[PDB]
Amino acid sequence: GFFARLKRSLLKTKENLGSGFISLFRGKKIDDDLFEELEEQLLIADVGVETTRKIITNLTEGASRKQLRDAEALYGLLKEEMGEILAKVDEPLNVEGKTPFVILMVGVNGVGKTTTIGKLARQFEQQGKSVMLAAGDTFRAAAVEQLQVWGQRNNIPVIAQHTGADSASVIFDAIQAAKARNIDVLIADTAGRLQNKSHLMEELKKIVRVMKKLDVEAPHEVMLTIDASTGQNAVSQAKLFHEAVGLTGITLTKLDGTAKGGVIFSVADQFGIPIRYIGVGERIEDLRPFKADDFIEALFARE
Amino acid sequence: GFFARLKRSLLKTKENLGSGFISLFRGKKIDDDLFEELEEQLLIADVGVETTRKIITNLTEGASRKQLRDAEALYGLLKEEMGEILAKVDEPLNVEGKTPFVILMVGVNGVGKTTTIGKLARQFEQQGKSVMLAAGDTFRAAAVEQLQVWGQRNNIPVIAQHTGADSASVIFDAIQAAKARNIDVLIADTAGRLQNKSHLMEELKKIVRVMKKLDVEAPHEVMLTIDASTGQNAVSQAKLFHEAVGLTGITLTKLDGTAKGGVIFSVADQFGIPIRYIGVGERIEDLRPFKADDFIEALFAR
Ligand SMILES: Nc1nc2c(ncn2[C@@H]2O[C@H](COP(=O)(O)OP(=O)(O)OP(=O)(O)O)[C@@H](OP(=O)(O)OP(=O)(O)O)[C@H]2O)c(=O)[nH]1
Ligand SMILES: Nc1nc2c(ncn2[C@@H]2O[C@H](COP(=O)(O)OP(=O)(O)OP(=O)(O)O)[C@@H](OP(=O)(O)OP(=O)(O)O)[C@H]2O)c(=O)[nH]1
């Protein structure tokens, strides 16, 4: 769905990756120099050191068994190698059948986490589910009020406490109120300060502990939001949160507005954590369920 | 396919748009007066305020960097500018490989929903797919009876219940019967009264929720049917349905018999929702897959 808009949103990434490789292979023979030029181009596009070597090695071996001499035929092999990486993390989120389904949202500030919560909320509401938000980012007084106003405007209940309250208590109350009110989906926001890395990770563990007192299956999803325009910073952030709490899903925002599109391959390859959604714009449908076949087609389409 | 017929069917729109711009540019120089005359002509045709101002803006910018002086050289730039709007929403519906593929048809009464469902159902049958309909407009008994009669004539199963039944229950039963009978495509009609006591948007949300208890992928398509004759009312309807349920597709009916063909440009620019089908007549093949390149060629042909 919205395939054309996904192609348009990858325009800047497509200068270097996917269809941006056609110019490199044009009128050329398969020589080590092309593989070395291909290798710079992937590294420039933020595909990542380990992921690039795997692509170059698999491409090189792949073109040898198939006796290819023309560089243009590498395009097909490159498309399937990079689709293979993304296909391993294609697994859309299913939030049905729980009372409530609890989504704990983790990430650093500025990556677009609250924006992501808002769009998910609206999308779930469009499907006939009731939704409830927990303002677990308790020390940022402004953000908490922004969120409550947004709930008012959108008829979505937002559970909150005074500034500086315990994050686990707020989220504890939200689960109580959500079970009482027959909510299908609870989404909890969290703090995004990694300045003291030990403090946030310990806070997030306290939240999960408290949640398990109420439902031993909660959180049903631990989801990370990372920003594709921060390059390898997203890779690093994913590593910290995965080790500390155990991510079950990733949302990658802002693929529009960046020539750094390779980062999706790097997070897909290093971690194998299902990528649930990609953000490609400011519309609610811009938060799209990630499908690897469509992404690869949009990226490699020959405009 | 049927390009000649698509052209004839646009003939009333072509007086103002496309080939109807040839007269405005004939023997004229590029000046503010021409751009102002072009702007009003687009507005008279229902192209839309925002969309017309994007057209006039790029078209002014493009003619300056290229240093154009003759007005009849704007025809080519205008063709391209308008074809770019429509190319962003060119994306045909593909209903293959599901068991069943579920289409949810939404829209207000009178726009052509039931006719659209009938032609789609026939076209899918011609392609060797099996089709089933759900009569989800429960309160309208005469429509429920006519759809059942249409099914018997066309050998297409129709799932219905008693007058006033729960639409979400009718839809639930149709998805179960489609699964038991290996149906490839299930098309669900819905109520179309925007009166508040009807509670249509809540009714539509309940349908989608019931669908997900049986297949979390359903509905595979949420398609709005709107009418080109309604002018901006079609844009207003698109906004109401899109905010409430989320549209994945748009069928624009009744391009024939209207000089307001600008609505297709307005809907395309404002929403970016793919236009799966265009209705240009009373025949089965007059519900056509929308292809932007052909549409622009027929609109701008001499
Ligand atoms: N282009 C694009 N932008 C996105 C996307 N997702 C989020 N953003 C932007 O990311 C910025 C930060 O969003 P938040 O959700 O507030 O970020 P977080 O800090 O993670 O949340 P927090 O509130 O701290 O929990 C906002 O821009 P500002 O509010 O700063 O700008 P503008 O003023 O122009 O709207 C969003 O518009 C996306 O998919 N595409
Ligand atoms: N010219 C043209 N007409 C179309 C097209 N699509 C639909 N129509 C007509 O628009 C009218 C709407 O018919 P319906 O399908 O009942 O529309 P909706 O009311 O939206 O469906 P609903 O039944 O409420 O779900 C019908 O004419 P009447 O109701 O007057 O006929 P008559 O009344 O004699 O049939 C159709 O023939 C089209 O592409 N081109």
Cβ contacts of A303 on chain B, cutoff 8 Å: none
Residue B206 touches chain A, beta carbons under 8 Å:
yes
Residue contact A128–B89, C-beta within 8 A: no
Of the listed ligands, the closest to the CA of B280 is 2
Residue A127 touches chain B, beta carbons under 8 Å:
yes
3-state helix, strand, coil in chain B (%, to 5): 50, 15, 35
Contact residues, A window 232-291, toward B, CB-based 8 Å cutoff: 283-285
Give the number of A-B residue pairs with CB atoms closer than 8 Å: 44
Question: Could you tell me if A252 and A224 are in contact, meaning their C-beta atoms sit under 8 angstroms apart?
Answer: no
Pairwise CA distance, residues A105 & A113, whole Å: 7
Q: Is the shortest distance between the CB of B109 and ligand 2 below 6 Å?
A: yes
Phi/psi class of residue B2: alpha, beta or left (left: φ > 0; alpha: ψ in -120 to 50)?
left
Angle at A82 between CA A81 and CA A84, to 5 degrees: 65
Residue contact B248–A2, C-beta within 8 A: yes
Of the listed ligands, the closest to the CA of A256 is 1
**Displacement of CA B301 from its chain's centroid (Å):** 23
Which residues neighbour A160 within 8 Å (Cβ) at sequence distance 6 or greater? A134, A135, A144, A147, A148, A170
> How far, in Å, is the centroid of ligand 1 from the Cα of A289?
18
| d(CA B101, nearest CA chain A) in Å | 14
Q: Reported resolution in A?
A: 2.4
> How far, in Å, is the centroid of ligand 1 from the Cα of A169?
26
* Ligand 1 atom with minimal separation from the A143 CA: 23
Angle at B240 between CA B236 and CA B246, to 5 degrees: 125
Which residues neighbour A14 within 8 Å (Cβ) at sequence distance 6 or greater? A20, A261, A299, A303
Residue among B205, B220, B224, B275 with most chain A CBs within 10 A, to mutate: B205
Query: Where are the alpha helices (H) located in chain B, listed in sequence order?
Result: 3-9, 22-25, 32-44, 49-65, 74-87, 113-126, 141-154, 167-180, 200-212, 232-244, 263-271, 292-300
Question: Could you tell me if A81 and A73 are in contact, meaning their C-beta atoms sit under 8 angstroms apart?
Answer: no
| Residue A190 in tokens | 């969290």
* Way the structure was solved: X-ray
What separation in angstroms does the CA of B47 have from each of B43, B86, B104? Answer: 6, 12, 28
Q: How far apart are the first and last CA of chain A?
A: 19
Pairwise CA distance, residues A60 & B255, whole Å: 54
Closest to A285 (Cβ–Cβ): which among B87, B89, B246? B246
Residue B216 touches chain A, beta carbons under 8 Å:
yes
* Ligand 2 atom with minimal separation from the B113 CA: 20
Of the listed ligands, the closest to the CA of B110 is 2
> Is A157 strand, coil or helix?
coil
> How far, in Å, is the centroid of ligand 2 from the Cα of A18?
46
Residue B201 touches chain A, beta carbons under 8 Å:
no
| Residue A155 in tokens | 């008829």
- The backbone torsions φ and ψ at residue A107, rounded to the nearest 5 degrees and listed phi first, read 160, 175
Cβ contacts of A129 on chain B, cutoff 8 Å: 209
Residue of A nearest to B246 (CA): A126
Give the domains, in start order, of chain A with CATH numbers. Answer: 3-88 (1.20.120.140), 101-300 (3.40.50.300)
The closest of A15, A275, A225 to A115, measured between CA atoms, is A225
Residue of A nearest to B219 (CA): A127
Ligand 1, atom 10: nearest CA belongs to which residue?
Answer: A112
Q: Which helix (H) or strand (E) holds A249?
A: strand A249-253
